[PDB]
């Protein structure tokens, strides 16, 4: 944190509302993931490739 | 008006009257002079009824002086009626003869300082050798202890692997022991974080080894009552003397 | 991605980084020239 | 004098550099063989476990096997730190392995590593001195 | 001569820096896209398992 | 990182010449090597009654 | 690194003598003593 | 690392006084907090559905 | 946290870390002037 | 500037500042002529007949 001269580093830079955009990109793609998981489960439940027992 | 060299280029932003634009003029300090500046000002528009630059004393300045000389002070910018007090933001024989005096007396001074420096080097090697003899033995004992700590850590790993290996295949089930064998890994993660927060130092293996080596070394130097401050003082002094003798190689 | 975009725009970059090295050379030379013109002590490598 | 001396030292450098290029491409092909063999082991382990999970065994058979394989490799990286005094880091281990192959190949082929290395040091040490002597700020040459 | 050459090289920089800033932003936007696409892959691989 | 100390931009970092082909062409047949050496090993354990099931 | 600043190739890396044999002489008996106290702990734990 | 370029040896690095028992005195009661919250979450989970 | 406390108490951090560079520069220059090799 | 300019540069600047001038010179305190390539600081040691 302290340089050679004894001075102090500038401000640790943040981003444009990082928490909100991280949440707003992690949650809908989570929904797309569970949707395509259900869709793949039905798609090979139709054929005999599935394995629930 | 505004002359801003935040770009590095002092760029005046100015207007003539009866003009739409607060026109910005970029100029070099040293090569762009008043003359080619007025060339730019006369190709930009048609306000060349009269345009000049006057002194704060009101005297007409030279039309060929550099702007570097101009913007060092304020001035009167001359349009047909109004006056811009533009504000931009912002012995010698003795030094030469002292360099001349020392130029006569470098070589004998260096030739004297070489003998003096080799004398200091030799005397501090003499003062450093009997402490070095104790330092080698204390370092050998601390290295033996840290090496046995490395082998004991490997012992811990092999013994933990053995106790985890036997029960699952010969006595108990993997279904009832997999949680314990996960929580040992999670406890190792917590122990890594505990070494970090305890020591203000990241848990990596060479730095941890050197940490324990220095603690065992200062324990051994305390128990053998070694003078560590004399030792590293003399090491620093001999390193400084060697740096100076490297300087004298030219 | 940068060399991709520069080749897509056919950006000449040898002139650019040669220019930047020349500018950095000049600024290091001014930082060495800070010594004899203000402090009046000898110079380095 | 300085430029003739430095060209004499480059002239002495000239055969040894070509010998070093030959032994270096040899050791480089050997360490690339080692890297691809590590990838080979990394692949064939996954093939073995791909069989032993579904095709002819179950998961509860091979789940402790995979667990102790990962724990054994985690212990083996500590063993690597015991063997040589550095952690198992991929460019660092690649540097150690390549340079070990380099010294093995130079011991076999028997060319002067030291007369290469001392003289290659003297190249840059005299070149820095020529660079400082040709300074456009510290006037020596007209 | 050096402060002359410095501003000569500054003016020689002045047209080309704008094209460099355009290419830099044009590639930085794609790098932001691939970072958020990596996080997209991670969130989808969480969800299809969950 | 991105630029030099001078601000100059680094040269293009090299990719391996047809590297993506050369990696998977070593991955997949050695997956078959792991197939073969396991289907032989399970039969070797089945022959001499050391096998678990 | 492989070369130094001057093209100076770094010297032969330090190994410790018989080190694979030294680690193989130490991994085995500590695994075996873990086996031993595994027996000692397993026969005694649910005995109480 | 253990020896500086001069050849000196680095001083005894800072150890947090009683920090090991600080870790031991913070891990244990927060482990008991985890013990309490497991029961007091599972009970209100199962009983108020 | 230090920049948060800086924005709170408003103690001219820019002047402080400018003056640190200045005092280190002047201290290195004085040690440069006190060469044990050259008459000064 | 005394450290950079000679007499001839100052005289060409005085030349171009007007147009109705044809003969310019800088003389000594004596009658002799200071040349074009003479430094300004050597000229500013004493007075001069402009």
From Swiss-Prot, chain A:
Which regions of this chain are Mitochondrial intermembrane-facing, per the record's topological domains?
Answer: 38-53
Question: What is the residue range of the motif GXXXX[G/A/S]?
Answer: 33-37
Post-translationally, this protein is described as follows, namely: Undergoes proteolytic degradation in neurons: degraded by AFG3L2 and SPG7 before SMDT1/EMRE assembly with the uniporter complex, limiting the availability of SMDT1/EMRE for MCU assembly and promoting efficient assembly of gatekeeper subunits with MCU.
Q: Where is the signal peptide?
A: none
Q: Where in the cell is it found?
A: Mitochondrion inner membrane
So which stretches are on the Mitochondrial matrix side? 6-17
Q: What is the effect of changing residue 11 to W?
A: Abolished interaction with MCU
Transmembrane annotation, as ranges: 18-37
- Assembly, per entry: Component of the uniplex complex, composed of MCU, EMRE/SMDT1, MICU1 and MICU2 (or MICU3) in a 4:4:1:1 stoichiometry. The number of EMRE/SMDT1 molecules is hovewer variable, ranging from 1 to 4 copies per uniplex complex, leading to uniplex complexes with distinct gatekeeping profiles. Interacts (via its C-terminal poly-Asp tail) with MCUR1; the interaction is direct. Unprocessed form interacts (via transit peptide) with MAIP1.
Q: What does this protein do?
A: Essential regulatory subunit of the mitochondrial calcium uniporter complex (uniplex), a complex that mediates calcium uptake into mitochondria. Required to bridge the calcium-sensing proteins MICU1 with the calcium-conducting subunit MCU. Acts by mediating activation of MCU and retention of MICU1 to the MCU pore, in order to ensure tight regulation of the uniplex complex and appropriate responses to intracellular calcium signaling.
Family affiliation: Belongs to the SMDT1/EMRE family.
Which organism was this protein described from? Homo sapiens
Swiss-Prot record, chain B:
A GO cellular component term found in this entry reads:
uniplex complex
Summarize the impact of residue 175 to E: Partially functional; does not completely abolish calcium channel activity. Does not affect interaction with MICU1
Which positions carry N6-acetyllysine?
Answer: 246
Outcome recorded upon mutating residue 181 to A: Reduced mitochondrial calcium uptake
Effect the entry attributes to changing residue 175 to A/Q: Abolished interaction with MICU1
Regulation (activators, inhibitors)? MCU channel activity is regulated by the heterodimer composed of MICU1 and either MICU2 or MICU3, which act as calcium-sensors. At low calcium levels, MICU1 occludes the pore of the MCU channel, preventing mitochondrial calcium uptake. At higher calcium levels, calcium-binding to MICU1 and MICU2 (or MICU3) induces a conformational change that weakens MCU-MICU1 interactions and moves the MICU1-MICU2 heterodimer away from the pore, allowing calcium permeation through the channel. MCU channel activity is gated by EMRE/SMDT1 via the juxtamembrane helix loop.
Keyword 4Fe-4S applies: no
User: According to the UniProt record, what happens if one changes residue 154 to W?
Assistant: Abolished calcium uptake
S-glutathionyl cysteine-modified residues are: 23
Record's catalysed reaction(s): Ca(2+)(in) = Ca(2+)(out)
Q: What results from changing residue 205 to F/A/T/K?
A: Does not affect gating by EMRE/SMDT1
Q: Which residues cross the membrane?
A: 148-169, 177-198
Tell me the impact of changing residue 23 to A: Abolished glutathionylation in response to reactive oxygen species
| Juxtamembrane helix: region residues | 199-204
Q: One biological process GO term for this chain?
A: positive regulation of mitochondrial calcium ion concentration
**Molecular function terms, GO-annotated:** calcium channel activity; identical protein binding; uniporter activity
Family that this chain belongs to:
Belongs to the MCU (TC 1.A.77) family.
This one is known as Calcium uniporter protein, mitochondrial
The organism named in the record is Homo sapiens
- Upper taxonomic classification of the species? Eukaryota, Metazoa, Chordata, Craniata, Vertebrata
| Gene that encodes the chain | MCU
Give the fragment's position in the full-length protein: 75 to 336 of 351
Curated annotation (Swiss-Prot), chain F:
Q: Where does the sequence pass through the membrane?
A: 19-38
Q: How is it modified after translation?
A: Undergoes proteolytic degradation in neurons: degraded by AFG3L2 and SPG7 before SMDT1/EMRE assembly with the uniporter complex, limiting the availability of SMDT1/EMRE for MCU assembly and promoting efficient assembly of gatekeeper subunits with MCU.
Q: What happens upon changing residue 38 to W? A: Abolishes calcium uptake into mitochondria. Promotes association with MCU, protecting SMDT1/EMRE from degradation by AFG3L2 and SP7
Q: Which residues lie on this side of the membrane: Mitochondrial intermembrane?
A: 39-53
Origin: domain of life: Eukaryota
**Protein's job:** Essential regulatory subunit of the mitochondrial calcium uniporter complex (uniplex), a complex that mediates calcium uptake into mitochondria. Required to bridge the calcium-sensing proteins MICU1 with the calcium-conducting subunit MCU. Acts by mediating activation of MCU and retention of MICU1 to the MCU pore, in order to ensure tight regulation of the uniplex complex and appropriate responses to intracellular calcium signaling.
Q: Which family does it belong to?
A: Belongs to the SMDT1/EMRE family.
- Protein's name according to its UniProt entry: Essential MCU regulator, mitochondrial
Organism of derivation: Homo sapiens
User: What taxonomic lineage is listed for the species of origin?
Assistant: Eukaryota, Metazoa, Chordata, Craniata, Vertebrata
- Gene symbol? SMDT1
Q: Which residues of the full protein are shown?
A: 48 to 100 of 107
Swiss-Prot record, chain G:
Q: Which UniProt keywords apply?
A: Calcium, Calcium transport, Ion transport, Membrane, Mitochondrion, Mitochondrion inner membrane, Transit peptide, Transmembrane, Transmembrane helix, Transport
Q: Where is this motif: GXXXX[G/A/S]?
A: 34-38
UniProt KW Metal-binding keyword: no
- Provide one Gene Ontology biological process annotation: mitochondrial calcium ion transmembrane transport
Write out the PTM section of this UniProt entry: Undergoes proteolytic degradation in neurons: degraded by AFG3L2 and SPG7 before SMDT1/EMRE assembly with the uniporter complex, limiting the availability of SMDT1/EMRE for MCU assembly and promoting efficient assembly of gatekeeper subunits with MCU.
Q: Does the keyword Amino-acid biosynthesis apply?
A: no
Source superkingdom? Eukaryota
Where found? Answer: Mitochondrion inner membrane
Transmembrane intervals: 19-38
Which residue intervals are topologically Mitochondrial matrix?
7-18
What does altering residue 38 to W do?
Abolishes calcium uptake into mitochondria. Promotes association with MCU, protecting SMDT1/EMRE from degradation by AFG3L2 and SP7
Give a GO cellular-component term: nucleoplasm
- Report the main location listed first in the record: mitochondrion
GO function term, MF aspect, one: protein-macromolecule adaptor activity
What is stated about domains? The GXXXX[G/A/S] motif at the C-terminal part of the transmembrane region mediates interaction with MCU and is required to activate the calcium-conducting pore in the uniporter complex. The poly-Asp region at the C-terminus mediates interaction with the polybasic region of MICU1.
Sequence similarity: Belongs to the SMDT1/EMRE family.
Output this protein's name: Essential MCU regulator, mitochondrial
Q: Which organism is it from?
A: Homo sapiens
Gene name per UniProt: SMDT1
């Amino acid at each position: 944190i302290v340089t050679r001269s004894g001075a102090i580093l500038p401000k640790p830079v943040k981003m444009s509302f990082g928490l909100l955009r991280v949440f707003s990109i992690v949650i809908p793609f989570l929904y797309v993931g569970t949707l395509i998981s259900k869709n793949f489960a039905a798609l090979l439940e139709e054929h005999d490739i599935f394995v629930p027992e | 008006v505004t002359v801003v060299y935040q770009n590095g280029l002092p760029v005046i932003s100015v207007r003539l009257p009866s003009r739409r634009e607060r026109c910005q003029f970029t100029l070099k300090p040293i090569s762009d002079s008043v003359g080619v500046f007025l060339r730019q000002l006369q190709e930009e528009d048609r306000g060349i009824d009269r345009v000049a630059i006057y002194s704060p004393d009101g005297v007409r300045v030279a039309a060929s002086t550099g702007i570097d000389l101009l913007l060092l002070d304020d001035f009167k910018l001359v349009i047909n009626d109004l006056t811009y007090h533009v504000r931009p933001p912002k012995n010698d024989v003795k030094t030469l003869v002292q360099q001349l005096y020392t130029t006569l007396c470098i070589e004998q001074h260096q030739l004297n300082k070489e003998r003096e420096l080799i004398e200091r080097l030799e005397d501090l090697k003499e003062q450093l050798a009997p402490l070095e003899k104790v330092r080698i033995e204390i370092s050998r004992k601390a290295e033996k202890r840290t090496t046995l700590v490395l082998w004991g850590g490997l012992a811990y790993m092999a013994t933990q692997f053995g106790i985890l290996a036997r029960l699952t295949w010969w006595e108990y089930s993997w279904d009832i022991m997999e949680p314990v064998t996960y929580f040992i890994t999670y406890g190792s993660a917590m122990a890594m974080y505990a070494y970090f927060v305890m020591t203000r130092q990241e848990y990596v293996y060479p730095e941890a080894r050197d940490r324990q080596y220095l603690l065992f070394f200062h324990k051994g130097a305390k128990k053998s009552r070694f003078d560590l401050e004399k030792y590293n003082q003399l090491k620093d002094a001999i390193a400084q003397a060697e740096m100076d003798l490297k300087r004298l190689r030219d | 991605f940068f060399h991709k975009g520069a080749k897509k725009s056919r950006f000449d970059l040898e002139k650019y980084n040669q220019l930047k090295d020349a500018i950095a050379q000049a600024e290091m030379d001014l930082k060495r020239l800070r010594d004899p013109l203000q402090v009046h002590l000898p110079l380095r490598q | 004098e300085l430029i003739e001396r430095l060209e004499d030292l480059k002239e002495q450098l000239a055969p040894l550099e070509k010998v070093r290029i030959e032994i270096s491409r040899k050791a480089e092909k050997r360490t690339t063989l080692v890297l691809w063999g590590g990838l080979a082991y990394m692949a064939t382990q996954f093939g073995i476990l791909a069989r032993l999970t579904w095709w002819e065994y179950s998961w509860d058979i091979m789940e402790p096997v995979t667990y102790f394989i990962t724990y054994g490799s985690a212990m083996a990286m500590y063993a690597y730190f015991v063997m040589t005094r550095q952690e198992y880091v991929y460019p660092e281990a690649r540097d150690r392995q390549y340079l070990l192959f380099f010294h093995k190949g130079a011991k076999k082929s028997r060319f002067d590593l030291e007369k290469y290395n001392q003289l290659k040091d003297a190249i840059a040490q005299a070149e820095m001195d020529l660079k400082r002597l040709r300074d456009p700020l510290q006037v020596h040459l007209p």
